[PDB]
Amino acid sequence: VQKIGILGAMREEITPILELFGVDFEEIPLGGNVFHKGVYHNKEIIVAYSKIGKVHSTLTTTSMILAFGVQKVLFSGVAGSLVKDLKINDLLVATQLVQHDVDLSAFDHPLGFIPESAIFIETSGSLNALAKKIANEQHIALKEGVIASGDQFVHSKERKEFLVSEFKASAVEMEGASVAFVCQKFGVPCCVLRSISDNADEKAGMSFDEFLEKSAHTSAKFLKSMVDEL
Amino acid sequence: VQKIGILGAMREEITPILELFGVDFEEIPLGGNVFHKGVYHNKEIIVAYSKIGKVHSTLTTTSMILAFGVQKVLFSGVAGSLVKDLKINDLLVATQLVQHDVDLSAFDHPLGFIPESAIFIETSGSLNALAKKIANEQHIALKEGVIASGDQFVHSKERKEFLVSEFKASAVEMEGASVAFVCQKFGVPCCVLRSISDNADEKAGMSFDEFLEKSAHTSAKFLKSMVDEL
Numbered sequence: 435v436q437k438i439g440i441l442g443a444m445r446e447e448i449t450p451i452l453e454l455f456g457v458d459f460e461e462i463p464l465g466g467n468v469f470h471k472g473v474y475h476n477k478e479i480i481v482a483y484s485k486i487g488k489v490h491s492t493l494t495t496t497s498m499i500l501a502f503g504v505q506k507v508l509f510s511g512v513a514g515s516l517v518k519d520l521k522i523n524d525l526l527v528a529t530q531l532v533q534h535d536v537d538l539s540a541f542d543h544p545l546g547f548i549p550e551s552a553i554f555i556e557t558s559g560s561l562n563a564l565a566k567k568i569a570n571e572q573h574i575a576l577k578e579g580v581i582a583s584g585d586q587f588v589h590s591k592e593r594k595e596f597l598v599s600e601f602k603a604s605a606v607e608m609e610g611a612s613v614a615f616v617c618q619k620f621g622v623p624c625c626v627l628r629s630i631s632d633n634a635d636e637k638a639g640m641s642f643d644e645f646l647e648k649s650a651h652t653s654a655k656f657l658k659s660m661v662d663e664l
Numbered sequence: 665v666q667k668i669g670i671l672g673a674m675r676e677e678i679t680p681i682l683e684l685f686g687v688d689f690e691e692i693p694l695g696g697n698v699f700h701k702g703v704y705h706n707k708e709i710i711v712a713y714s715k716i717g718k719v720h721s722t723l724t725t726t727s728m729i730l731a732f733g734v735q736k737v738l739f740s741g742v743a744g745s746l747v748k749d750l751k752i753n754d755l756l757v758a759t760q761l762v763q764h765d766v767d768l769s770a771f772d773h774p775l776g777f778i779p780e781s782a783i784f785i786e787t788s789g790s791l792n793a794l795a796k797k798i799a800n801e802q803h804i805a806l807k808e809g810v811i812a813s814g815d816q817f818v819h820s821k822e823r824k825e826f827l828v829s830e831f832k833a834s835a836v837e838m839e840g841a842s843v844a845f846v847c848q849k850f851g852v853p854c855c856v857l858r859s860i861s862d863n864a865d866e867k868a869g870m871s872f873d874e875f876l877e878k879s880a881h882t883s884a885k886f887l888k889s890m891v892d893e894l
């Protein structure tokens with residue numbers, strides 16, 4: 435009855451999700467994505483990785499809604515930390531997201547702003563509150579804050595400082611804003627969950643390669659614990 | 665029978681299109697866009713502006729295909745020139761497009777490249793050849809070349825030089841690559857047509873404000889002349 439879309443960006447972000455749910459899936463190709471459709475605890479779960487970045491994630495989210503009729507979207511994967519209290523493996527949910535690389539300042543628009551839109555995109559308060567409930571019950575830390583998304587891998591102190599000063603972001607990645615954006619356009623509740631893989635600095639490539647697997651698994655496991663209470 | 669999607673980014677890019685076709689339209693809202701559906705010369709034409717930038721244009725193109733079933737997409741609007749021979753009001757069609765702001769160089773990927781994708785996206789050779797045919801019949805100039813798209817308005821000599829050296833782009837805008845990308849994923853022929861509004865330099869804001877209306881109309885008129893031969 436209930437249909438839940440579950441997204442990662444990279445194949446590595448959904449491999450643990452498919453394993454952890456542990457049910458059979460049917461593969462359905464559409465728009466260059468493969469959607470894994472299964473039944474888990476009397477819900478239909480549609481799992482896919484978008485591929486990296488904003489165009490890829492916008493397309494896949496739109497397909498999930500328009501073609502598969504999902505009623506909620508939960509995103510799971512990894513992110514770069516922009517704040518000292520978010521360390522490798524730590525979890526956060528995005529309260530709001532921003533497209534940090536949007537620049538129409540030539541027309542005196544604030545950075546991140548596009549006409550007929552807004553700088554910040556909201557996610558589901560209800561899903562975020564569920565996440566918080568669960569993390570307290572499991573005795574694990576969970577931050578809530580702003581996630582910045584853009585089409586560059588961030589690995590420089592200069593760009594971190596910009597994201598912190600301009601948007602007060604807590605983490606950076608490349609898909610969350612686009613997924614939340616599409617969901618809000620269609621009135622679909624959305625939760626964006628990330629586990630820290632790196633510190634978005636000059637060492638980020640190294641850290642990301644080291645921690646992608648573990649951080650993705652941490653996010654996946656948490657996402658499943660959310661689905662278990664929906 | 666035949667269904668043709670017609671896109672602009674800004675309302676100003678489609679105002680002349682609706683006027684020039686000169687038929688009645690029904691308005692259908694979906695995903696935060698308004699789609700104008702009409703019949704012209706025994707074709708169904710679905711006209712919309714996406715709103716600015718890559719997420720907006722990806723969403724709208726995806727909706728056109730998945731929700732409205734369009735069989736071809738023609739994009740019309742304005743662009744910044746990166747080459748001396750493309751002057752204000754001149755027309756070009758994109759032979760290929762690139763997302764110029766994509767940077768995964770931290771993992772030794774070439775600029776513009778995303779794993780499981782490609783730097784350059786192709787458009788319909790057939791539609792481009794039609795455009796060329798028509799422009800010769802009308803005795804108007806039409807260039808064919810690479811268009812670079814990203815989520816920044818380009819207005820600096822440094823960024824122009826980069827687009828020319830890195831991608832050999834002839835023009836810059838903020839939507840074309842995303843529209844062509846979605847179309848290719850779904851096997852839908854796509855043509856991206858632009859009229860020059862500015863030179864993508866420090867004076868670009870000024871020039872754009874001056875020439876948006878005329879350049880949009882020039883593009884719209886040409887697009888209609890294409891539809892008249894489909």
Ligand SMILES: Nc1ncnc2c(CN3C[C@H](CSc4cnccn4)[C@@H](O)C3)c[nH]c12
Pocket residue numbers: 443444485486487512513514586587588589606607608609631632633634635638642768771779
């Ligand atoms: N510092 C950071 N900046 C921007 N994004 C991130 C992320 C999250 N994901 C990982 C991946 C990096 S690109 C990639 C990965 N592997 C191969 C090629 N490209 C992209 O999907 C966004 C983690 N840390 C980040």
Ligand SMILES: Nc1ncnc2c(CN3C[C@H](CSc4cnccn4)[C@@H](O)C3)c[nH]c12
Pocket residue numbers: 538541549673674715716717742743744816817818819836837838839861862863864865868872
């Ligand atoms: N130099 C350039 N760089 C990048 N893009 C362009 C374009 C084409 N369009 C116009 C518009 C500019 S932003 C906008 C316009 N008006 C108000 C707010 N933002 C965006 O839709 C892309 C023309 N010249 C360009």
